[PDB]
């Protein structure tokens, strides 16, 4: 979230109900945002991954309540979007087909990657597993370096 500066009205109707759920998130974030003296690259990456997951989760919760459950007013949702709470682009992506389970947006920036493609997470476990079986080796990848996303795919 951003800081309130009397720009937007404090909150629409149903914020008081959801606020305590997404205020747990804030605590988690706070725990995350600090020097965990990781002393090690992988460990360091893990905290970032965790943070990313947390970010995703809040958005999902919001998204779930507004679209799937539909228990929150449109206005409130809009307000949330305007604030830093939800991710707008991510939500949009989710709403689109084939991107519903989506760890993060930068796992589908095809420009970013060295090989002109999407993140592996986006490959359904099924396909990778099949490939592995064909080869001889076991399941090859666990989670990507952008965000911890073991089997991000929509399956």
């Amino acid at each position: 979230p951003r800081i309130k500066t009397r720009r937007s009205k404090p909150a629409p109707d149903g914020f008081e109900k959801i606020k305590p759920t997404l205020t747990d998130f804030e605590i988690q974030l706070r725990d995350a945002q600090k020097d965990k003296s990781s002393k090690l690259a992988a460990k360091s990456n893990e905290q970032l991954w965790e943070i990313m997951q947390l970010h995703h989760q809040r958005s999902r919760y919001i998204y779930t309540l507004y679209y799937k459950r539909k228990a929150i007013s449109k206005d409130l949702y809009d307000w949330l979007i305007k604030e830093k709470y939800a991710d707008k682009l991510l939500i949009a992506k989710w709403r689109k087909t084939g991107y519903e389970k989506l760890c993060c947006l930068r796992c589908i920036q095809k420009n970013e990657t060295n090989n002109g493609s999407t993140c592996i997470c986006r490959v359904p476990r099924a396909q990778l597993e099949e490939e592995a079986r064909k080869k001889g080796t076991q399941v090859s990848f666990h989670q990507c370096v952008h965000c911890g996303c073991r089997g991000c795919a929509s399956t």
Partner: protein, 51 residues
């Protein structure tokens, strides 16, 4: 276990039995759980393999 990647029998677990020489055996397993029937020339022991 016969391993599907490595293509051979690989050692998975070992258990000590607390108690003649068993010259034969049969494994059973169903939903109930895995048993080994251990046989001598004239007697047998049914041993369960539990978690």
């Amino acid at each position: 276990k016969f391993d599907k990647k490595t293509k051979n029998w690989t050692k998975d677990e070992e258990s000590a039995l607390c108690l003649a020489d068993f010259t034969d055996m049969d494994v059973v397993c169903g939903d109930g759980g895995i048993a080994a029937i251990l046989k001598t020339n004239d007697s047998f022991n049914i041993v369960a393999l539990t978690p």
